[PDB]
Design a protein around this ligand. Structure first.
Ligand SMILES: *[C@@H]1O[C@H](CO[C@@H]2O[C@@H](C)[C@@H](O)[C@@H](O)[C@@H]2O)[C@@H](O[C@@H]2O[C@H](CO)[C@@H](O[C@H]3O[C@H](CO[C@H]4O[C@H](CO)[C@@H](O)[C@H](O)[C@@H]4O)[C@@H](O)[C@H](O[C@H]4O[C@H](CO)[C@@H](O)[C@H](O)[C@@H]4O)[C@@H]3O)[C@H](O)[C@H]2NC(C)=O)[C@H](O)[C@H]1NC(C)=O
Ligand SMILES: *[C@@H]1O[C@H](CO[C@@H]2O[C@@H](C)[C@@H](O)[C@@H](O)[C@@H]2O)[C@@H](O[C@@H]2O[C@H](CO)[C@@H](O[C@H]3O[C@H](CO[C@H]4O[C@H](CO)[C@@H](O)[C@H](O)[C@@H]4O)[C@@H](O)[C@H](O[C@H]4O[C@H](CO)[C@@H](O)[C@H](O)[C@@H]4O)[C@@H]3O)[C@H](O)[C@H]2NC(C)=O)[C@H](O)[C@H]1NC(C)=O
Ligand code: HEM
Ligand code: HEM
Ligand code: HEM
Ligand code: HEM
Ligand code: HEM
Ligand code: HEM
Ligand code: HEM
Ligand code: HEM
Ligand code: HEM
Ligand code: HEM
Ligand SMILES: [Ca+2]
Ligand SMILES: [Ca+2]
Ligand SMILES: [Ca+2]
Lengths: 144, 146, 150, 149, 144, 144, 150, 149, 146, 146
């Protein structure tokens, strides 16, 4: 439903836990994008400069590292609207010229969720909270 | 007594205590060592199957045959018809042996002591005593197991 | 010695870092981020100007904060990549070109923010290893300052 | 004398225990008895007549069920004694003395029973192993049916 | 092929084994429905009263518990046509007003199978037996 | 990109490793085909003689054993164009009368890759090398 | 003894085989494949003709090679199937019919290529067990020669 | 003296053993020899002339192959002795005395060989680790090519 | 003899017994301790590489160089051309040392004893004896290894 | 050669590798599996002791008899008189079998590979080769073991 205060705390953690700290990260990433490009192989035409054809190459993993690295920045701020918006914003001016359809900001949302559930287990995963707050982060990159 | 509830129970406790593979041979050797210690005399009734030595394949095979039977009988506790058909089939095989029904009482205690000592404290002694009286009456016929 | 960032140095830095820097603790990050830049500036005055598009003069400006966190979160991504060097190289050069299109950014700029970290870490992170940390902080910046003026 | 390697008897005794033990509801035993004989007969109907006493007229009779059970019960004792050639050899000799001292029993009938089991069981057992069983089951058949014309 | 006598025994077991006894159940369920709604997200519009939007919530898990709990009742009777039909029937009068397409009674069939295979392993899973008998249970809820 | 000399060595190994030696093989196979028929259930109409309806039966596993067994023969020769072609050829005359669309020789290619990655792990899997050389083996069965 | 291919015999043959025969070693295969046929022919002369469509006379012909490897790779598939007999049967009979549509192929043909292996294996594979191997090589051919003339 | 940390030498020695050992068919060795030199040359063709004795004229000659093998064999002994600075230091001194007492060998040539290996190997090794190798391989290069103008 | 079948074999047994990393240094130290015990005298032929002490890095490096060579040579057993090219290259390096071919016989026994004692009972002594005669003849040339 | 020093040695290495109890049967089965793989043909020379199957008690007993002999022979290496008396006694038992002395060469390699692979790297291949030539010459007489 709504990305309230409580939901932002439970998300900060669940993410931090699943985003690991530098071991199962290369796997986290690979798991999300190998879901994005399966539900939307069309999308890979946007990551032409970062080898979207083969998500196994360094060049691309470096990309996904850059993406998920950003998703962090944001989640890390779901509990600070001020400095949060100031980033979601600094991110909006970066995905405008890339012509990204809001429909795509929703296929990645799901992939991320399929991966975080994958990492931390469905038994505990909280969707209404992950679906809620993730939206907030995308409806900020889309400039709102 | 020995209502179906206890029959389904004696089946589980048994299946568990009896085990499979080597377990079976081992369980049987303990049951018969129990019988011949409860009633030394009972032993001479089996000279034909080399009861002179319990380890001889002749006698191990007998053990395999009997408690092997006990297994099948108990396995039918939930089908009066079959159970009775086969419980009868045994009476005819045992009648001519002219066997004192008193040993069937020992086979009862031997059996109990072995299943109980193998299955652990939760052994249902009553359920077992009852439902075995059914097998004895079916085999011996003696009104001692009524 | 060799000064190389060895696999052991990597496991150690990665660990010490992991505890202090995570999305679990919003506020743990800010505190460190600011601390670093706040240490740079007071050591390299004519460096605030390099960060004008992000209010380098207003350490608390909601803009510079979002900045500070971005830079350090940048280091985070790298440290976590010490585990997969092939990728870390592709990622450290993309960061190299990206730091060249900026002005007054020098190999000497990093060397400062490097002392910046060496004096800041030991205050928040317990069990800090300046020597090991340094050998790997440097391993990372040498891939950033690839194409840069002293 | 020698039946099957140990690791074999093992695979067989495990799978067998999965579908045959005193903990199984009389409802399944019956289904197996029938299945096994309704398959033996369709292969050798000339053998159906051998089961008069056991009321083969009706395969649904507490009389006939007991018979399939004591047949399967004997095949229960063999599989579970595969690791003891000593006793197993005697157990199978004893079973031959009987199936032979009985009239009209042709060895080819057992072969029929073999193929039946080989075909029937894999429908009950998970990942049934045809080879392990063949190496263990064949010796049993021939040992039991040793003397049958 | 046909859901014979033999096939019903091997199914009773394989199910009982995979349906567990109360531990990996919450996972069994979650695995089946997270397959149903992936091959037919359309279907979730029928479980509106049991939160079909988020299969992670209690309300819904309670639902799936109710469903799979029923599937059991039935499998538990594949070896008793009398009391079996009497249940498949008592179930038919319950899914009529729910307007369920027989096509759907086949997407759930597969999901269940994808989960039972998942639990007990493909190496042993028996499809012709699971496809056969499962049909029989659905062609009874459909009133035949 | 191109199936060079280096790429053929790294593929020979990665395959041999994932193709196992006779243990996780029945699983290797089952994993590939249970991907082929999910992305192209249409295809199963060609394996009518080897029970393509239920990839769990012996008859079919025996088939997949025959297929993957061939894929081996080929990979085993990526480092011997002479005796290699002579096999890719001997294979072309065998899939002509079977009317196989080159589109299908590409759905199996991917399935194989989804399985080899599955066996040996994405962290090491080399796509550009697997996509490259696999093509070479199919553009030989297709008669070129 | 029984002569049956026991589960132990299977694990052993499978192992000894696995090491010597794998896509890892191209060349390890060729060497063995040729060796076998080259041993058959010099023991069963009027057998070369059975393999004319594959240049049985030219042991090095790029055609016979692709052959040799196919036959042995056939055995491989089987040996690996000793782990799943239900499947191995379906696979050994498909190979049976397939070897009947060929001419002069006899149960005695195999018995030769069988001695062929028993003298070749021990030279390349270490820790060879003729007895165990044989009990399972035979287990496989008895399913191939199902429908065949002596 | 000091080459690379232990856990490093470890990562390197493992990956190396994956693609280089006496159990590998002469067919691959050859492919590596060529690959490594056909890449060294395209980087420094001026160095191709140094391999006359080894018949560099033809890179497909049993003569030249042996040379790439003894080069790679020497680089086999270094990687496998990374955990023993003592002996490794001597082994690399011995290799310098030779590459130096040889005319026309420029240190920049080795640097070329380094970049070649760094680029070539990751095509053969799974999850090749550029860093571990750099920390271990560089010391080797400089140690071997210590004296080359 | 030493047909390709045995060559592919000696390669596997070797690669296995020789191991990698520290294994190599260790295997070599055992082989040379075998040589100097089979023929004490053979030792003085290596004074230039500090054979006074086998643990000195000077000598450990020699061991690394030689059996390091043995490794490469054996690694080419399946390529007559290369094998012979390099087997020749060694003859020239060893010819001037003026070495009695008898030691090459000891290096043979030392080698065998070490690979066999490291590889286990399945060591193919014959295959190994044959294919090593190939290396000796290629290096020494003495018709002692024919 | 095969001076007493090596004789006392081959005795220790042997006694060690041969072991006692089950060890013996096992060691022998490896030695003979080595012989029949070194020379497939050598096998048909033992049809009389059921060499069709190496696990048959007929053949296991043969193995027990032969290497059992090897044991005694080697055990006397330090007593020329006895050693020769019994080494002769064997020649007469083997002479009529009309056996190609070439197999005795295989028995040599088989033996070596098994003792060496069982005793570990310190196997003295030379000492063993020499002192076995003594046993072969004593049994076969062929000047092949001189
Ligand atoms: C094969 O042989 C069997 C022989 O039956 C078996 O062996 C016998 C020696 C007995 O020991 C049996 O226990 C054993 O099954 C033939 O089938 C059996 O035949 C009997 C008939 O005597 C079947 O019994 C049915 O009828 C009983 C009694 O019915 C009477 O009493 C009830 C009150 O309880 C009245 O309501 C009836 O009007 C009648 O007067 C009854 O308990 C069952 O019927 C009830 O339950 C059914 C539910 O299953 C309902 O559908 C009925 O409406 C009713 O309420 C019995 O059906 C006995 O069941 C069968 N056994 C089997 C396996 O079904 C069999 O015919 C023969 N094969 C052939 C055809 O050749
Ligand atoms: C680079 O140098 C090599 C030098 O070759 C290498 O070094 C030499 C010193 C030798 O030690 C070689 O073993 C080693 O490869 C040049 O290439 C080699 O050149 C030879 C020619 O002498 C190639 O050999 C081919 O021919 C032989 C013999 O052919 C004659 O005899 C056969 C009967 O066996 C007759 O059928 C022929 O008519 C002829 O009279 C033959 O064994 C091969 O040909 C057969 O096999 C082929 C299958 O691969 C078939 O396609 C043929 O139809 C025929 O049946 C050889 O092809 C030798 O192979 C090459 N080596 C290589 C790597 O191929 C090389 O030319 C030079 N580079 C350049 C061009 O500058
Ligand atoms: C979850 C929200 C997202 C975040 C936080 C995010 C973040 C980022 C960042 C930090 C970069 C690169 C910055 C640089 O180094 O220059 C980037 C690049 C990019 N992003 Fe996103 N992104 C998000 C969603 C998306 C979506 C949904 C798409 C569309 C399919 C997308 C497409 C791209 C492309 C095409 C690039 C450029 C890559 C390149 O430089 O070659 N992003 N994103
Ligand atoms: C309920 C328990 C018992 C069962 C299930 C049982 C079962 C059997 C069976 C199946 C046989 C042999 C059938 C054949 O030859 O094929 C047998 C034989 C025999 N039983 Fe029992 N029995 C039981 C109790 C007893 C008792 C208490 C005695 C008495 C001491 C006894 C004495 C014998 C004797 C003497 C034989 C003949 C053995 C021979 O010479 O072959 N049994 N029993
Ligand atoms: C090695 C540690 C460093 C890391 C990880 C790092 C990382 C980053 C990142 C991630 C950004 C923003 C990228 C984006 O907007 O998408 C950035 C921007 C920037 N960095 Fe760094 N940086 C480092 C050191 C430095 C140093 C030493 C200087 C020099 C004074 C510097 C100057 C800048 C400037 C001027 C910007 C642009 C800020 C803006 O957008 O207004 N960085 N850095
Ligand atoms: C290997 C599988 C078989 C086993 C384990 C087996 C076992 C048995 C056993 C335990 C008995 C009971 C003896 C007694 O009354 O004490 C029996 C009886 C009998 N068996 Fe079998 N049997 C097998 C196969 C067969 C076959 C293939 C036939 C023939 C078509 C057959 C025909 C009979 C007959 C006619 C009786 C006597 C029934 C009666 O008393 O009325 N058996 N069998
Ligand atoms: C495998 C066969 C199935 C069984 C055994 C089954 C069983 C059940 C049971 C026991 C209930 C709830 C009873 C209650 O507590 O009031 C239920 C409810 C329901 N079922 Fe099924 N069902 C099956 C298949 C399906 C299918 C294929 C659909 C359609 C997509 C479906 C849709 C529903 C709906 C919409 C409800 C009502 C939930 C609610 O009360 O909010 N069921 N089912
Ligand atoms: C990766 C490349 C492929 C290889 C190496 C391969 C190999 C083989 C082999 C060895 C056989 C059976 C030979 C026999 O025993 O008679 C076979 C049969 C067959 N293949 Fe393929 N195949 C490949 C791709 C395909 C593809 C893409 C399709 C199409 C969907 C296909 C369809 C078939 C069919 C329908 C059969 C006949 C099965 C039967 O006999 O019932 N194959 N293939
Ligand atoms: C048990 C071991 C054997 C195995 C595993 C085996 C396997 C095979 C295979 C896989 C093929 C080719 C199938 C295809 O083309 O798709 C084949 C072909 C053939 N095999 Fe065998 N085979 C064996 C023994 C024999 C024996 C003993 C003979 C008898 C002389 C024989 C004669 C042939 C012939 C004549 C062909 C046809 C070759 C051609 O296409 O020109 N095979 N075998
Ligand atoms: C680190 C990598 C290298 C290693 C391990 C290495 C190793 C060796 C070895 C073991 C030899 C043989 C000495 C002998 O004959 O006993 C050798 C020879 C030689 N190396 Fe290197 N080498 C390397 C790099 C280079 C480079 C980069 C060049 C120059 C372009 C080079 C040029 C030569 C030459 C010219 C010979 C003599 C060839 C002859 O005898 O005809 N090496 N090297
Ligand atoms: C086939 C086995 C052998 C191989 C592969 C081999 C290999 C080598 C190699 C590669 C070198 C040094 C090359 C360099 O300086 O770069 C060498 C040196 C030498 N070898 Fe051998 N060798 C073998 C057997 C022997 C034997 C049996 C002797 C005799 C006792 C021997 C005596 C020497 C001596 C005296 C040196 C010179 C050491 C020095 O002062 O540097 N080698 N050998
Ligand atoms: C030094 C090693 C050998 C020793 C100590 C040895 C010892 C013996 C002994 C003690 C016997 C049987 C005595 C008896 O019957 O009481 C025997 C029998 C025999 N040996 Fe040897 N033997 C040796 C080598 C060989 C070799 C190399 C061959 C040849 C292939 C061989 C072939 C035979 C044969 C054919 C028999 C007769 C077996 C029979 O039918 O009973 N022996 N040996
Ligand atoms: Ca959304
Ligand atoms: Ca259906
Ligand atoms: Ca393609």
């Amino acid at each position: 439903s709504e990305c309230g205060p409580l939901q932002r705390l439970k998300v900060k953690r669940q993410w931090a836990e699943a985003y690991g700290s530098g071991n199962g990260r290369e796997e986290f990433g690979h798991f999300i994008w190998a879901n994005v490009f399966k539900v939307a192989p069309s999308a890979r035409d946007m990551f032409k400069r970062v080898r979207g054809d083969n998500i196994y190459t360094p060049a691309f993993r470096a990309h996904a590292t850059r993406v998920l690295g950003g998703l962090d920045m944001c989640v890390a701020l779901l509990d600070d609207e001020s400095v949060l918006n100031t980033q979601l914003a600094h991110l909006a001016s970066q995905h405008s010229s890339r012509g990204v359809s809001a429909e795509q900001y929703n296929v990645v949302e799901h992939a991320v969720m399929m991966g975080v559930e994958h990492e931390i287990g469905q038994n505990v995963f909280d969707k209404d909270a992950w679906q809620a707050c993730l939206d907030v982060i995308t409806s900020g990159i889309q400039g709102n | 007594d020995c209502n179906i509830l206890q029959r389904l129970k004696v089946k589980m406790q048994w299946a568990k205590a009896y085990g499979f593979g080597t377990e079976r041979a081992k369980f049987g050797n303990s049951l018969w060592t129990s019988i011949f210690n409860y009633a030394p005399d009972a032993r001479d009734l089996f000279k034909s199957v080399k009861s002179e030595d319990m380890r001889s394949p002749q006698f191990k095979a007998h053990i395999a045959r009997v408690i092997g039977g006990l297994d099948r009988v108990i396995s039918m506790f939930d089908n009066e018809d079959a159970l009775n058909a086969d419980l009868e089939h045994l009476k005819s095989q045992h009648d001519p042996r002219g066997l004192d029904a008193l040993n069937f009482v020992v086979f009862g205690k031997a059996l109990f002591a072995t299943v109980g000592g193998q299955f652990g404290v939760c052994f249902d002694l009553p359920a077992w005593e009852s439902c075995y009286k059914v097998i004895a009456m079916g085999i011996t016929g003696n009104d001692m197991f009524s | 010695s060799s000064n190389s960032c060895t696999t052991e140095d990597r496991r150690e830095m990665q660990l010490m870092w992991a505890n202090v820097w995570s999305a679990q603790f919003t506020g743990r990050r800010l505190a460190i981020a600011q601390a670093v830049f706040k240490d740079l500036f007071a050591h390299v005055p004519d460096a605030v100007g390099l960060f004008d598009r992000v209010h380098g003069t207003e350490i608390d400006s909601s803009e510079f904060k979002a900045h500070c966190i971005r830079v350090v979160n940048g280091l985070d991504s790298a440290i976590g990549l010490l585990s997969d060097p092939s990728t870390l190289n592709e990622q450290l050069s993309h960061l190299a070109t990206q730091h060249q299109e900026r002005a007054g950014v020098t190999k000497g700029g990093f060397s400062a923010i490097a002392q910046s970290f060496l004096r800041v870490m030991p205050q928040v992170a317990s069990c800090f290893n300046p020597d090991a940390w340094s050998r790997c902080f440097n391993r990372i910046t040498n891939g950033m300052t690839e194409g840069l003026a002293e | 004398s020698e039946f099957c390697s140990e690791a074999d008897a093992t695979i067989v005794i495990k799978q067998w225990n999965q579908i045959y033990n005193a903990g199984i509801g009389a409802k399944s035993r019956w289904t197996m008895g029938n299945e096994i004989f309704s398959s033996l007969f369709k292969l050798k109907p000339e053998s159906e007549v051998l089961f008069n006493n056991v009321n083969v007229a009706n395969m649904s009779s507490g009389a006939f069920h007991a018979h399939t059970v004591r047949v399967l019960s004997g095949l229960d004792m063999g599989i579970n004694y595969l690791n003891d050639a000593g006793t197993l050899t005697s157990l199978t000799a004893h079973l031959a003395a009987q199936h032979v001292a009985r009239t009209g029993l042709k060895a080819v009938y057992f072969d029929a029973m073999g193929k039946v089991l080989m075909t029937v069981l894999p429908s009950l057992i998970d990942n049934f192993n045809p080879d392990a069983w063949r190496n263990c089951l064949l010796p049993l058949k021939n040992a039991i049916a040793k003397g049958l014309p």
